[PDB]
């Protein structure tokens, strides 16, 4: 019932700025300290900052590496907490999580996280091609369809089928960076009857370019 949701990620240049937001619900927000933790493939999980309570005069504490560049703040009325980031560096690249300072002594509830990429390379929305049967005989769980997502930057890209309604047997390999771009594939398996009679589409989202791409695989 406790809910925490961050937003505001994307691609930034060095040394630019960026602000993240976190909205909590399901608990008396004002009674808890709030935290920001980031995860990068170079340094793993790293605590960034914390901001305490009203009675504490909203005392804040930052990790040595972001001290003087990042500012954390809260707004108890709207159950939100923000993270202002300035003079960003490549090292600041990673997924940023908003977490609650639990009464039990640990960060108990985390949000889904929002990704941040600090780079001098620009954003490129993905290209999506259909992976279709390839005209063959039914011998592999009954028909397999997919969406090939190529040439995008930065990461991540999320893929869903039938807007999420279709979630059984969905397979999405991890992205691979080559020639300066990422690409991945997402495939789903469905009964050779429920297709093409029925509609199957893939939903490819790319936060950095704020695009949602909907493609329906037809027999063609």
């Amino acid at each position: 019932e406790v809910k925490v949701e961050e937003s505001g990620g994307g691609l930034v240049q060095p040394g630019g700025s960026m602000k993240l937001s976190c909205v909590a619900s399901g608990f008396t927000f004002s009674n808890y300290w709030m935290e920001w933790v980031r995860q990068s493939p170079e340094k793993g999980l790293e605590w960034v900052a914390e901001i305490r309570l009203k009675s504490n005069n909203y005392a804040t504490h930052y990790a040595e590496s972001v001290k003087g560049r990042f500012t954390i703040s809260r707004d108890d009325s709207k159950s939100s907490v923000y993270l202002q980031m300035n003079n960003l560096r490549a090292e600041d690249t990673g997924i940023y999580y908003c977490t609650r300072g639990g009464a039990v002594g640990a960060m108990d509830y985390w949000g889904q996280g929002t990704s941040v990429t600090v780079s001098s390379a620009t954003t490129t929305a993905p290209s999506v091609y259909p992976l279709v049967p390839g005209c063959s005989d039914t011998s592999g769980s009954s028909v397999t369809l997919g969406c090939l997502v190529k040439g995008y930057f930065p990461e991540p890209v999320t893929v869903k089928w039938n807007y999420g309604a279709l979630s059984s047997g969905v397979r999405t390999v991890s992205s691979v960076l080559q020639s300066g771009f990422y690409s991945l594939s997402s495939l789903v398996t469905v009964p050779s009857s429920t297709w093409p009679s029925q509609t199957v589409i893939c939903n490819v989202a790319h936060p950095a370019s704020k695009v949602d791409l909907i493609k329906e695989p037809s027999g063609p």
Partner: protein
């Protein structure tokens, strides 16, 4: 800072079995107030980390009694009895006695029964041709172990360059893997040939699983 080193780095375990993750810190985590703030978290593929154990041994809400933790000086341990599919992911240890720090993480993999792959080959979509390249995809679905080799043959001849292989994380349900091999050619290279074949060799067989199409 306080460094937290976890071992092992990767942990293969059979369903229903027992797994054990350790966490060692560079200094004592005993706080002046007498508590030790060492915690454990589980992060499943795609999901954010979830708290399992707080203050060395207290289980968080909804955390089954299968997860138990202990401590002794600078050494801490997380134990998972009766391991089950849903348990896959990365487990992290963290401390909040001093400036909060986290360990490197331990990926828990489900050691399950071998499963032979199902191969599907998708010729390039005409929609890709104007990009200047063509991608033929060979999808190997629901197999285990993870290791697999895909070979590509263009008109009988083996083609090694232009290939990109990538895997999925282990599936929460049946604990299998899927992987796709993508052969990318220049548009004209693709049209100067007619047979495209990918052969997959997995532990589950001697003879290559072959799939191919002709234009």
């Amino acid at each position: 800072d306080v460094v937290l080193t976890q071992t092992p780095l990767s942990l293969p375990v059979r369903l229903g079995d027992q797994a054990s993750i350790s966490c060692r810190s560079s200094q004592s985590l005993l706080h002046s107030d007498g508590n030790t703030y060492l915690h454990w978290y589980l992060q499943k593929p795609g999901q954010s980390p979830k708290l399992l154990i707080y203050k060395v041994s207290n289980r968080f809400s909804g955390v089954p009694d299968r997860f138990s933790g202990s401590g002794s000086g600078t050494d801490f341990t997380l134990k998972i009895s009766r391991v089950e599919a849903e348990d896959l992911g990365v487990y992290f240890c963290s401390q909040t006695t001093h400036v909060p720090t986290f360990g490197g993480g331990t990926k828990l993999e489900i050691k399950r029964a071998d499963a032979a792959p199902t191969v599907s080959i998708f010729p390039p979509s005409s929609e890709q041709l104007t990009s200047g390249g063509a991608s033929v995809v060979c999808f190997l679905n629901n197999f285990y172990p993870k290791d697999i080799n895909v070979k590509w043959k263009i008109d009988g001849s083996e083609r090694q360059n232009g290939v990109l292989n990538s895997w999925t994380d282990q599936d929460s349900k049946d604990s299998t893997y899927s992987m796709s091999s993508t052969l990318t050619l220049t548009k004209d290279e693709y049209e100067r040939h007619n047979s495209y074949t990918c052969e997959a060799t997995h532990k589950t067989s001697t003879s290559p699983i072959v799939k191919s199409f002709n234009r």
